Design a protein around this ligand. Sequence first.
Ligand SMILES: O/N=C/c1cc[n+](C[n+]2ccc(/C=N/O)cc2)cc1
Ligand SMILES: *[C@](C)(O)CCC[N+](C)(C)C
Ligand SMILES: *[C@](C)(O)CCC[N+](C)(C)C
Lengths: 540, 540
Amino acid sequence: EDAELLVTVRGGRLRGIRLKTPGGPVSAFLGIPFAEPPMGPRRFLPPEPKQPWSGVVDATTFQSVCYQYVDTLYPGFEGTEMWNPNRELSEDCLYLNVWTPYPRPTSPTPVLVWIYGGGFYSGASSLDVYDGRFLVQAERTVLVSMNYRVGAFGFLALPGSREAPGNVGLLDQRLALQWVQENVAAFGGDPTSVTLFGESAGAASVGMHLLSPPSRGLFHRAVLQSGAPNGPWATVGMGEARRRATQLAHLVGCPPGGTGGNDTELVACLRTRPAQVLVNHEWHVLPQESVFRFSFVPVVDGDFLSDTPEALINAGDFHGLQVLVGVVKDEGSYFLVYGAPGFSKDNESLISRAEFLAGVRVGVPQVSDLAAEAVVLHYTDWLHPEDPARLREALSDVVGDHNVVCPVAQLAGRLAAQGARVYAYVFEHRASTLSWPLWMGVPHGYEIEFIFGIPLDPSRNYTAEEKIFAQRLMRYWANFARTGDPNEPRDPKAPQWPPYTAGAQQYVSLDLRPLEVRRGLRAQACAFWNRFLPKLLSAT
Amino acid sequence: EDAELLVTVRGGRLRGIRLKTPGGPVSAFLGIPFAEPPMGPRRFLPPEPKQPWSGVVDATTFQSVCYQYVDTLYPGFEGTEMWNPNRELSEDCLYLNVWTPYPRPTSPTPVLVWIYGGGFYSGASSLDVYDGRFLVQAERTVLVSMNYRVGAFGFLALPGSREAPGNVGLLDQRLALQWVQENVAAFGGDPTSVTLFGESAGAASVGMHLLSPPSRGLFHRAVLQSGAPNGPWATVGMGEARRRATQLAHLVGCPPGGTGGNDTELVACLRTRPAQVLVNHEWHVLPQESVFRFSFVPVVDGDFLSDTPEALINAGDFHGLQVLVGVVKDEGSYFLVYGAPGFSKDNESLISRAEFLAGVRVGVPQVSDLAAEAVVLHYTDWLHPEDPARLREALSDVVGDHNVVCPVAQLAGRLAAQGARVYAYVFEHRASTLSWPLWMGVPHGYEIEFIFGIPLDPSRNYTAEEKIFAQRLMRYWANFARTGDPNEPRDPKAPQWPPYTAGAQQYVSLDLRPLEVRRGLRAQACAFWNRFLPKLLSAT
Ligand SMILES: O/N=C/c1cc[n+](C[n+]2ccc(/C=N/O)cc2)cc1
Ligand SMILES: *[C@](C)(O)CCC[N+](C)(C)C
Ligand SMILES: *[C@](C)(O)CCC[N+](C)(C)C
């Protein structure tokens, strides 16, 4: 009988399970309840801490996935099914998972907390690509991941009211962080060295916890991968959030014909509807045809976010704080097959000049015709203005820069210039197991396999070079979690990773080649997005 | 009294002079009166043809230069003194010069007609760099060059009135072209093969004769050198011309107010003032502080120019026509020492960013602050935004693109795509005798000495390669005048000069190295000027 598989926390006792890796076993505790089930009258409300239980709760398998839209654009396609839920859907989903080395570390170990992405409408901590058994075995750290409510169940906001205040999905993450502060020591983790890291909407979530005082004291380092809280998709206004929430209620028969429409009776009608009914009309509340836009996202409400993320980043002090930001090579190619005209994953997507002009309005929604004209000017090779391959490559850069690269570069510049020591990277390796077409390059979200050491899985057809490449990245992320510096402390031989500053703007490229230092996070393109375009919209 | 130094034209007899070149003698006729002196009551009026004379008019020396401002920015400096008048100033200046080979050609020879530049306010056909003795001797061509009225005496316009119609300086050029049609045969020239070529304001003049029906029938080919009629400095509106003419009259005490008032009394007062008095106040009528802007320029009057140059270029049929357009490598550096803050020819002109932002308002006058912001965005290296050396080259590119490179590319594109066969070049050789500082590169106007074979002058200290480079350029311009094609009619070993089309946009680089074909006359920069910026000013 293994004795390290039974741990007592503040709520009660748990029974873990031993997982095998090619390098050794790891103890895992999957499915720990950190909150009461937010069902019935608790729907749309902030989470309550899990009451203590009797007996031993089985923590040997992942729990249910929160209710969310299921992608059916390409049924049976690996590139999309790998992000779909792998457990049953249920509103009873507020559970977290803890991986710890075997034997348990006798000394406090830094903790890595993972927040998944999925446009705030999907995602789960049980995805095979988020398996933290390889990162914990190789680097001997403590990895924690939680489930937070997505979609309307986590971000439907009627601002002002108390039945649906909004940002409760962010409160699910915060309550999970307080859980780590109160119980990670029982697994050998150091609550004084907590490193958040997420991707896409999870990276924006990490950024929003960085701008919220209550969540600020629950962690010490941050890693934002292909996402930022100041992105044009990450937040929404109080007025737009009320319109989307009321639009969703109307599509499901709320309120009934002849009944008033105040916030109390509107949420009361929404709480009676089945969960799947709300999901079926989630995308029907978006205002326009667009890519990289999602219905229910965090709302600027003055509570969790006292002001807009851009305002909080500008007027913030980030001294004594380390951040690791970065993007992939092709941030926008993934979203073009979700609405952009002429784009298909099954051909070369050699779009025409007319389709490229239509895609700009889809990639950059709610901009004046003059503003769209400026985007066409900057992203047109006027020496080959009709080349389909260049127009395809340009529209991918339009969506990538507007939503990811430039919001991230804006964040990294203000962080470094205001007390924070930040490190920047660009992931440029295309995996050999990638099922997406070649023209997509390195799509949004396909560095997570190497960060979690997935190539080390013997049942997968990765190459020997990619396995070594995965161990490098796991060492980088672990060194940042341990010392706040991705460079090996006992190593002057390997190429150095210089910090990112507002002036030099240095970053490194991550691929099979050794580290290469470059400058400028698309500075020429992002000067248009971060400087000129705001002024162009002010003058209408 | 050689037999070939006495020629009878329709007006009378002329005695020429025999000039000497290192390769042979050339007959020249300098100072032929082609119009009555525009003095007294003839000031501001269109020219009248020269009446027949008795006896023999001495045509052995250059005649008087038209009254013009004399540059005194750098007294004693060769770079500026070379363009200043080298003869006595006088309103009696409407004279032309003819160079013809010795012995006189027995068969009709193509004719080259030179129109000097000088911002429509200065210039003369007697300048040493315009000596046509080397081009005529080497290529056996007939070179003609005339003087036209510049400044207020040639372009002061009170639109509507008959006393000051405007564009009379252009009418001086047209009357000289009718003179070539009626007399160039007496020198061995072919009146059916006339090639206009000019630089800066002369190149713009060549372009305006292409857009005027009465002038089109007087020539068959055109060469525009670092200038275009659609330039933002080459024309003014009828309302602005009236304001500038009235302000000039006010500064010289016209009318003796409150005498009044209409155009007839205003011009009558201006005709009584000495010529030097009008020149002393020419620059005091400009609306703003700017570079590359001139007081009295051609006016869109509806007679000589039925519409704006931009409109006439778009709606024009140019079939059966060959042009040779081109620019120098550094078009804007010359004008920066004339008013941009921080710029001086005696230091490195390492300007700061504050001076760069101030120079943008001087280089691009009368634009909105939003339009200026767009210019700063395109011409800023956002990785080195404060590098003085990069800010210096950026402001030079701003002035060069706004005034020369992009107006030329705009004209060259519409010309090729509407019937005309276009050849484009970029002059990239810096003369070893150049007295301007090094940071100016190849300044505006310093390809003319190589086109005229000035390096062949033994009294000048050119290099051996520059002499061969001059002979190769003279063959280019001569071949274009003879056949409409700069390439040698039979030589296959020399690299080919491909035409310029709106799609491929091919041009060649002119320097000591052989011909090198490139693509794009700064297509990225000129798309901002020719496409986006017009729409940015429509929505103020
Ligand atoms: O037959 N109609 C199917 C269909 C219904 C609803 N949607 C909404 N939708 C937009 C974007 C995305 C992906 N975002 O990254 C996912 C889902 C798409 C397709
Ligand atoms: C991001 C906006 O959350 C998008 C994430 C999409 N996956 C496929 C990477 C989860
Ligand atoms: C052009 C606008 O005419 C300027 C010509 C200046 N020089 C020095 C070349 C005559």
